[PDB]
Amino acid sequence: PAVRISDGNLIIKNRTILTGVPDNVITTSASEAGPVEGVFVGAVFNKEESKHIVPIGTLRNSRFMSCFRFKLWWMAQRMGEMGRDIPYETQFLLVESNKVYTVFLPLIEGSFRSCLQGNVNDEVELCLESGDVDTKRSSFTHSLYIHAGTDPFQTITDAIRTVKLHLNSFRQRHEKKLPGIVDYFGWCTWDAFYQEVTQEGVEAGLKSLAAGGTPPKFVIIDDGWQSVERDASPIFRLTGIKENEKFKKKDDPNVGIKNIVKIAKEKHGLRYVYVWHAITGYWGGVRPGEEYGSVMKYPNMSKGVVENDPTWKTDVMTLQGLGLVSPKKVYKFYNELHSYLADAGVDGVKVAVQCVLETLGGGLGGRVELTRQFHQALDSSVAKNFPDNGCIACMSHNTDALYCSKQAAVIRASDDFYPRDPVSHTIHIASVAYNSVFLGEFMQPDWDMFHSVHPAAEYHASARAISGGPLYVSDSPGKHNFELLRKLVLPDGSILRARLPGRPTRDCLFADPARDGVSLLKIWNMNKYTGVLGVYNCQGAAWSSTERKNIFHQTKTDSLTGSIRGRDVHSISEASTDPTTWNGDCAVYSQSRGELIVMPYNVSLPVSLKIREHEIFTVSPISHLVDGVSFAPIGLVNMYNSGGAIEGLRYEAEKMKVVMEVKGCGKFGSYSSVKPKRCVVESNEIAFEYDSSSGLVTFELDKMPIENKRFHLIQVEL
Ligand SMILES: OC[C@H]1O[C@H](OC[C@@H]2O[C@H](O[C@]3(CO)O[C@H](CO)[C@H](O)[C@@H]3O)[C@H](O)[C@@H](O)[C@@H]2O)[C@@H](O)[C@H](O)[C@@H]1O
């Protein structure tokens, strides 16, 4: 077929990937769909137990990259050559045999959830768990899926499709409705006030940002608005669905969060208002009580999580427990909550603490069946009450939840932005890129909030710009960098969102740019008519396998050199108006240096960077109109994702004309191999500059497109 087991070996296009597959491991190419290009894998065991480890075979001398849970809530990256290097809790694994790429998807099957892990003998072990000592099983047929192909990202997509067609319990990213917040700049209260947020806090924040010319059009009222109590650092539990004191106008206390929602929308011009809540109500769940059938439960410890995060064994939540709402009443709980919120004008929720459900499998059906039931009810309640699909999933990097991700369309792709922890910044940019390789198959990644005023602001902000996801800050009011923010946000609060999850280049997939001391991390994305490439140095910090937390670690040179090729933007062909006849030549524009460079296909351009430095490049395919006349739009050169502005593009070779639809305002740049005769913006000739040495054509779009008539129409005549 292409992937087979014969002898005791796993073979993929005649390369031996695994040796010593034990005889009880069985393959099958049947879903109901039904023949299938890769292979499903499970095993038969002697006894009917609620857990199994089972070697799959022995990995040696094949580069792999993995996404593995280093906390319960979150994944990050790990590269190796050998089985022993594969961490506990590995949820996805990609393997390069050297040309050919292979993906391993441990899956949910019935009431069980797989992940991978390695042992010291270099075996890849599958780990099946029901997370409920009463749900037990002896055989498994479809608990890992393996599939190969020649394009690493296409390989991943095809494999997720195939898993989707087996399970029918989720939708791929591209098939879900994104909520409208992804198109606008936002503000999150969380880093501004933490749990001490108030409604006066909210207003001040929306005011200062609008003052500086970059207005948020959404806001996330983060953890802090809910009514909660300790029992009587002890844990808080939800006492009501309605807002605490800080969100009732100080005058008519019967008016609640409706007040701040109105202030934000009518007074400060926001389109969307989102609020935070745990999947379980609050951190300690809901106060035990017959209303929602709430009952104290204690997180069960699974071996792999505890192995990577030892501190989870003594977390507030583990030791003090949570009031878990009953599955029978969980819809009721979310509907009552969300109906209150929505009928107050709230458009969406940011749903945190999602992974706990896996630990509360209790006597309730297990990790998979309880995660399902809660997610089914959350969705129903979201589709009823926030029907722009206003769900942001946070702290949910388990396959329990990803494989029943049917509706929700936006996922935080890492652990939090930490303004005060200097260790975190490089790790953030790496965890976000690597997890988006796999998380972006399901939901649109969210690179999380950041500070415009921070030593690492431009580092974080460039990443946000090229992430594909919502762009927001969590600034405290008045502490803003609007020179910075205008590179991301147009006068009306819109952004230049790229189309895909921001991901590492083919080049970077198997080299760990946090740990190897040698490579720069290159992130790629696409717009309609350009690509875009971020280059970062994210070296010298990472999750330690020994210390089991984020540490700094030693780094040899200060400055690393890599290189950039147009083809590093993996899908750059899609931006060409004529892919059949395109030679591969790209206009590359260094957004930070201000320089335009023509890059023939093949040709490299070196890039040097110290730790925490970055460079963003817009990559536009060059169109050859006639011999000597070549063109490629850049977009808005003083914005990070400059190419996000070009909504339309057409070449008229017969008349020597480029016609463009450009959104936004500010300086517009293009590469032209000859000086233009004219540039025209809405039927009016305009002033432009040309640098004959580089090709750079430049003029000013002075104002936002007028109307109600969304784009500037620009003709360039050559
Ligand atoms: O609480 C609001 C915040 O929750 C989401 O997750 C934060 C999570 O909490 C843990 O971080 C710490 C540990 O003490 O708890 C608070 C956050 O409540 C601190 O900021 C600490 O860093 C945990 O270690 C984290 O891994 C976890 O992400 C977060 O996604 C949202 O930002 C939300 O505002």
Residue numbers in the entry: 5 to 102, 120 to 253, 264 to 749
What is written in the article reporting this PDB entry?
The crystal structure of D383A in complex with raffinose was determined at a resolution of 2.47 Å. Lys75, Tyr78, Asp446 and Tyr449 help to stabilize the glucose moiety of the raffinose substrate at the +1 subsite. The NE1 group of Trp78 and OD1 of Asp446 form hydrogen bonds to O4 of the hydroxyl group with distances of 3.08 and 3.47 Å, respectively. NZ of the Lys75 side chain stabilizes O3 of the hydroxyl group through a hydrogen bond with a distance of 3.54 Å. Tyr449 stabilizes the glucose at the +1 subsite and the fructose moiety at the +2 subsite of raffinose via hydrogen bonds from its side-chain OH group to the O3 hydroxyl groups of both galactose and fructose with distances of 3.52 Å. One water molecule that forms a hydrogen bond (distance of 2.70 Å) to the side chain of Asp447 seems to be involved in stabilization of the fructose moiety through weak hydrogen bonding. The interactions of the residues at the −1 subsite with the galactosyl moiety of raffinose are similar to those with the galactosyl moiety of galactinol bound in the D383A complex. Our crystal structures of wild-type AtAkαGal3 and its D383A mutant in complex with galactose and with hydrolyzed raffinose, i.e. galactose and sucrose, reveal one water molecule at the conserved position near the anomeric C atom and Asp447. This water is replaced by O4 of galactose in the +1 subsite of raffinose and stachyose in the complexes of D383A with raffinose and stachyose.
